[PDB]
Each structure stands twice: as C-alpha cells, then as structure tokens.
Design a protein around this ligand. Structure first.
Ligand SMILES: [Mg+2]
Ligand SMILES: [Mg+2]
Ligand SMILES: [Mg+2]
Length: 175
RNA sequence: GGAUGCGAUCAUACCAGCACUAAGGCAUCGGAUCCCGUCAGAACUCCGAAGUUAAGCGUGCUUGGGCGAGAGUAGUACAAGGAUGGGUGACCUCUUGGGAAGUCCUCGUGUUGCAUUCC
C-alpha cells in the first residue's frame, strides 16, 4: 500500500504551569511514520498552539483494515487548495481497504483538479452503507446481477519472453 | 497601627472627585527689634507659642481616567533556510525553524533603607 493510516498521540511539554498537560490524538494518512509525525506536528501547531519544539511525541501506531477481502463503500471529506481559493468536497470510493480509497482520492484530485498532495487535508473518512451512498458510479456497482463485457482487452504476451517484433497474422480479439 | 529628617526604586507610587483620623510629630499660626527681604514681612529672613486640625500631610472609597500584570488576539501578521513548488503574472503553497501588536476581558493600585520618636 502506498498510503498508511496512523494514530499519532502527543502533548505539550510538561511544564511547572501544568505538569500534566492534555493529550491530543489524530488519525493521519502518510506514506511512512516520519511523514505522519511531521503532519501531526503541522496540525497541532495550527489547530492547537503546540509545536514540535514545545511538545512531546507519545505514541504512533498504524491502523489496519479489519476485513481486507470484502468490498466497502468509502466516503471521504477533504479540504483542498485550488489556484484561486480553498474549497471542501465530498468523494466516494469502492475498495477492499480504506488505504485504496485514499490512494484513489489522491489520484483523482491530481487528475480532475490538478491538486497535489500538500494542498489536501483529509477532514473525515468513514464507511458508508450501500443504502446511503450519494454519488453515482458507486450505486451502479451495487447491482447484484451486475453483468457487462470487457470492452478493452489489452492484447499482450504474458511474461515478455514471448514478445516478437513481427507476427504472421493480425490478432483476433472479441468480447 | 502613626509620624519626622535624610533617602532607594521613580505612576501598582500619577490624576479627578468624595470621606475620615487617638498620641505624637509635622503643619497651619502670632509678630517685624535684630540679620535678611521685596511695589508688597505675600514670599524669603529673624523672633515666638495665643489658637486650630479648617487646609497641608496620612488613610480609605469610585462598577472613575491612567499606569502595571495576565488572558486573548494567535501559531494570526511578519520573517530565517529549501523546492526543475503552483500560477501569465500579482502573489501564494508546502517543508525545516522563530514568532509579534491595538480593540475586547480579568486582576492589581506599591515595596523599602538609616536615625529619632508616638501609641
Ligand atoms: Mg505673616
Ligand atoms: Mg485636615
Ligand atoms: Mg483602574
């Protein structure tokens, strides 16, 4: 998986003023742990008033998909920066893991809106029952009798050893 | 709980308006020979001790002004380093660091040395 979910826990440095400071937790999506802790300290500085130099890092744990063999419907609420302004949007995805949905979200924002990873803030992630899905192209795959042909086959050899520059006849492909 | 003399800090001590104070000390106060002094014994100077706490000085009060400390403003504004970062540009993102100031709100309104002295 490209993206991992982590639970990061930290607090302000214990000082004689408090000596038992409040504990803060976040669920962040990053490619490894070092990038997860940096993004945590980014949000703690901007949302609370605790930055890394005044704070303590307590724990960091990776969250995993409970059932990576079923298909879930995944809603994502995000904040992104465009060329002119800030906007929030809701996106829906179908995947066996929420990791795949987050990778799907980042890829889609890059294509449809030319938005890079730094300019995106995941507000909220959740699993949505198929009865409550909102976006089209997610409901149409809720058909229990779903049937269709494969309209693009990608004719190719299997293991690159069987590749030849020339062939004696044109390929026959059908669907 | 007070004062006086000489101070330290130099508004938490200043300013404005009100109220009150035992003893003592300060002070107001009486006078113009002498020293001194002016248009003027008002001031300054000299000599006193009839009266008074009215003023001054001291203490307290005010949803007071100011001053001082907090909280908040706000991880905002700004700004050190990095990017073959975005954008036509103006500018703006992210990354490794630093980080303010009015309004608004809360609280406070001194501390203290040496000598002598009053309860
Ligand atoms: Mg006279
Ligand atoms: Mg009086
Ligand atoms: Mg005041």
């Amino acid at each position: 998986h490209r993206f991992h979910q982590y639970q990061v826990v930290g607090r302000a440095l214990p000082a004689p003023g408090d000596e038992q400071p409040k504990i803060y937790r976040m669920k962040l999506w990053a490619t490894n742990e070092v990038r997860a802790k940096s993004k945590f300290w980014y949000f703690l500085r901007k949302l609370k008033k605790v930055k890394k130099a005044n704070g303590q890092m307590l724990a960091i744990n990776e969250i995993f998909e409970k059932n990576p063999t079923t298909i879930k419907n995944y809603g994502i609420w995000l904040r992104y920066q465009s060329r002119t302004g800030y906007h929030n949007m809701y996106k829906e995805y179908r995947d066996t893991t929420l990791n795949g949905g987050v990778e799907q979200m980042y890829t889609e924002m890059a294509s449809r809106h030319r938005v890079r990873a730094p300019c995106i803030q995941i507000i909220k992630t959740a699993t949505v029952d198929f009865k409550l899905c909102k976006r089209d192209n997610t409901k149409q795959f809720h058909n229990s009798k779903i049937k269709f042909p494969l309209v693009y086959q990608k004719v190719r050899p299997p293991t690159r050893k069987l590749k030849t520059t020339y062939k004696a006849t044109r390929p026959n492909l059908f669907m």
